[PDB]
Amino acid sequence: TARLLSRSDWGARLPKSVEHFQGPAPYVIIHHSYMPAVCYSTPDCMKSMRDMQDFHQLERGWNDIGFSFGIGGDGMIYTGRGFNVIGAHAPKYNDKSVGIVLIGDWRTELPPKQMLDAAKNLIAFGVFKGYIDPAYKLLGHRQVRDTECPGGRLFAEISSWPHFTHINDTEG
Ligand code: NA
Ligand SMILES: [Zn+2]
């Protein structure tokens, strides 16, 4: 069922400015939104994308929604900054990652399968198109900053995905 929806599809405001990075992204960073909560209908998930964009641009002074892509509980994928655009989601990785937010609070609940499938399909499509390195490393936000994101339950889930790794597997 899953589709990639454009920025115009969810009624996004324009970015203030767009900065690019070059070549395939060597990292994929997974997030949860926490608030907004899980969205089951496409109207609610489009509103949730606008709510995050509004928080980021109009409360935090950012150029755009900080994420590359969002995933709704409708099983749809929502274009954020998109591929090869510098994000504002993961310090030290914003110019070398795809930042994917699974809308909701995933501290204790597992996202519904359609969200997990959509995230994996987005990554697979990014590798197919050459936007994501075929040897990408998969991380949760909590591995690169002092945060709970993407929630303990979703963290345990992504720990079972292909390409998951720990930064401290390499010494030095
Ligand atoms: Na920004
Ligand atoms: Zn995060």
Residue numbers in the entry: 12 to 183
What's in the article?
The structure of the PGRP domain comprises three α-helices and one central β-sheet composed of six β-strands, similar to the bacteriophage T7 lysozyme, a zinc-dependent amidase. We generated mutants to characterize the amidase reaction mechanism and solved the X-ray structures of wild-type Drosophila PGRP-LBPA/PC and its mutants in apo form or complexed to TCT.
Only the Y78F mutation caused complete loss of the enzymatic activity for every compounds. The introduced mutations did not affect the ability to recognize PGN, attesting that Y78 is the only residue taking part in the amidase mechanism. Initial X-ray and enzymatic analyses showed that the Y78F mutation does not destabilize the protein structure and prevents PGN substrate from being degraded. Both mutants Y78F and C160S PGRP-LBPA/PC share a similar fold with PGRP-LBPA/PC wild type with a RMSD on Cα of 0.49 Å and 1.12 Å, respectively, but in different space groups, P6122 for PGRP-LBPA/PC_Y78F and P1 for PGRP-LBPA/PC_C160S. By comparing the apo and complexed PGRP-LBPA/PC_Y78F structures, the C-terminal symmetry-related molecule is filling the binding pocket of the peptide moiety from the PGN attesting the non-physiological nature of this interaction. We showed that Zn2+ is totally absent in PGRP-LBPA/PC_C160S mutant as already observed in the structure resolution, while it is still present in PGRP-LBPA/PC_Y78A mutant and PGRP-LBPA/PC wild type. Regarding PGRP-LBPA/PC_Y78F, the amidase activity is also abolished without Zn2+ in the buffer.
